Scaffold this active site. Structure first.
Site, PDB file in Angstrom:
ATOM      1  N   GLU A 176       0.820  -1.209   0.000  1.00 29.76           N
ATOM      2  CA  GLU A 176       0.000   0.000   0.000  1.00 29.76           C
ATOM      3  C   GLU A 176       0.853   1.259   0.000  1.00 29.76           C
ATOM      4  O   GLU A 176       2.075   1.203   0.194  1.00 29.76           O
ATOM      5  CB  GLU A 176      -0.875   0.023   1.258  1.00 29.76           C
ATOM      6  CG  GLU A 176      -0.027  -0.041   2.525  1.00 29.76           C
ATOM      7  CD  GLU A 176      -0.813   0.057   3.799  1.00 29.76           C
ATOM      8  OE1 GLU A 176      -1.912  -0.531   3.880  1.00 29.76           O
ATOM      9  OE2 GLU A 176      -0.306   0.713   4.734  1.00 29.76           O
TER      10      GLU A 176
ATOM     11  N   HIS B 238       0.290   5.747   1.223  1.00 37.90           N
ATOM     12  CA  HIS B 238      -0.533   6.779   1.862  1.00 37.90           C
ATOM     13  C   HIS B 238       0.350   7.984   2.147  1.00 37.90           C
ATOM     14  O   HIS B 238       1.579   7.887   2.083  1.00 37.90           O
ATOM     15  CB  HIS B 238      -1.180   6.266   3.157  1.00 37.90           C
ATOM     16  CG  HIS B 238      -0.282   5.393   3.982  1.00 37.90           C
ATOM     17  ND1 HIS B 238       0.860   5.865   4.592  1.00 37.90           N
ATOM     18  CD2 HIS B 238      -0.368   4.081   4.308  1.00 37.90           C
ATOM     19  CE1 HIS B 238       1.447   4.878   5.246  1.00 37.90           C
ATOM     20  NE2 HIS B 238       0.722   3.786   5.092  1.00 37.90           N
TER      21      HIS B 238
ATOM     22  N   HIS C 286       5.769   6.290   8.041  1.00 35.55           N
ATOM     23  CA  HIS C 286       5.984   5.264   9.062  1.00 35.55           C
ATOM     24  C   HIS C 286       7.380   5.366   9.632  1.00 35.55           C
ATOM     25  O   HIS C 286       8.347   5.623   8.906  1.00 35.55           O
ATOM     26  CB  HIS C 286       5.885   3.858   8.484  1.00 35.55           C
ATOM     27  CG  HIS C 286       4.497   3.396   8.226  1.00 35.55           C
ATOM     28  ND1 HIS C 286       3.648   3.001   9.233  1.00 35.55           N
ATOM     29  CD2 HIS C 286       3.816   3.235   7.069  1.00 35.55           C
ATOM     30  CE1 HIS C 286       2.492   2.637   8.710  1.00 35.55           C
ATOM     31  NE2 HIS C 286       2.571   2.761   7.399  1.00 35.55           N
TER      32      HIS C 286
ATOM     33  N   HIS D 221       4.891   0.304   0.236  1.00 32.63           N
ATOM     34  CA  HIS D 221       5.539  -0.492   1.272  1.00 32.63           C
ATOM     35  C   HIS D 221       4.790  -1.765   1.615  1.00 32.63           C
ATOM     36  O   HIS D 221       3.574  -1.827   1.501  1.00 32.63           O
ATOM     37  CB  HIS D 221       5.816   0.341   2.531  1.00 32.63           C
ATOM     38  CG  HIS D 221       4.598   0.982   3.111  1.00 32.63           C
ATOM     39  ND1 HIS D 221       4.077   2.158   2.617  1.00 32.63           N
ATOM     40  CD2 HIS D 221       3.816   0.632   4.158  1.00 32.63           C
ATOM     41  CE1 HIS D 221       3.015   2.496   3.321  1.00 32.63           C
ATOM     42  NE2 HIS D 221       2.835   1.590   4.265  1.00 32.63           N
TER      43      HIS D 221
ATOM     44  N   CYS E 259       5.670   0.239  15.370  1.00 37.29           N
ATOM     45  CA  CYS E 259       5.271   1.107  14.275  1.00 37.29           C
ATOM     46  C   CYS E 259       4.694   2.403  14.832  1.00 37.29           C
ATOM     47  O   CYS E 259       3.711   2.376  15.575  1.00 37.29           O
ATOM     48  CB  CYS E 259       4.249   0.402  13.387  1.00 37.29           C
ATOM     49  SG  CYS E 259       3.588   1.428  12.054  1.00 37.29           S
TER      50      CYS E 259
HETATM   51 ZN   LIG Z   1       1.396   1.846   5.788  1.00 36.97          ZN
END
Ligand SMILES: [Zn+2]
Ligand SMILES: [K+]
Ligand SMILES: [K+]
Ligand SMILES: [Zn+2]
Lengths: 146, 145
Positions: A53, A55, A59, A93, A108
């Site tokens: 995905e 966005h 991260h 990623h 995370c």
């Molecule tokens: Zn992600």
């Protein structure tokens, strides 16, 4: 903004200077409205993977258990504890648990206010699979090996 | 106002959640290196055995994960032992100080903070007397002078 892998050895992270499934640890879901960030731990069984995905939100991952390989756009990077990964905005990623028996565990960290994940389409997939290492590692339901 | 939280860990499970003299700093992901995008900065701190961070309070929060050695943290009126991979949420305006305990192993911890944040405020004599009402805190804290 480019994605960064900062591998750790003996508590020294590469590229830094020394100056003198899910457990949500801290954030809104755990009762904390004050931080601008949410702090999570994820655990993935060997052979398992997160969703491929992208966005806008970034991260920051720290591997704390087991072995990973992370797909970062056109690169596949092997990780062990306590390697750190900065996943830049809009970078494709996917994290894969690559150990034999030991599950992958990683911290995370994300912004408290963040956008929704976006999945790759046929052209996204075709373009990113022009790299043989990426094509070999990525997993979607229409894409496995061969 | 929010409470500070200690989440101790065993075998990659943190309690409180469900499965569904100073420090040497390394900035892992932060603004100086050019990571302006996140709302937060991610640092590793290392404290030599017997060492301590500065006793302080501020509006911005900390999320700490101990990754090396042994710690004792002052969180307002509490003194809390820590080992890897215990997580600590330091709430807004709580007095905090981290101490490296143990003979020869340095204390190492991850510290995550908001990128947009206020300056640390130090205690004066009145703040110190107030927090030294608790005998545990009084023995633990270290101040300069
Ligand atoms: Zn992600
Ligand atoms: K490592
Ligand atoms: K522990
Ligand atoms: Zn502080």
């Amino acid at each position: 903004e480019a994605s960064r892998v900062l591998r750790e050895r003996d508590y020294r992270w590469e590229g830094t200077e020394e100056e003198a499934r899910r457990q949500t640890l801290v954030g809104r879901p755990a009762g904390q409205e004050a931080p601008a960030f949410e702090t999570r731990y994820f655990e993935v069984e060997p052979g398992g993977y997160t969703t491929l995905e992208r966005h806008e939100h970034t991260h920051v991952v720290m591997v704390v258990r087991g072995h990973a390989e992370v797909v970062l756009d056109d690169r596949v990077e092997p990780l062990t504890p306590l390697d750190c990964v900065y996943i830049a905005p809009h970078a494709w990623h996917q994290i894969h648990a690559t150990g034999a028996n030991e599950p992958l565990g990683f911290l995370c960290i994300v912004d408290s206010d963040r956008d929704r994940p976006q999945r790759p389409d046929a052209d996204d997939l075709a373009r990113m699979c022009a790299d043989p290492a990426v094509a070999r590692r990525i997993r979607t339901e229409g894409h496995h090996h061969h």
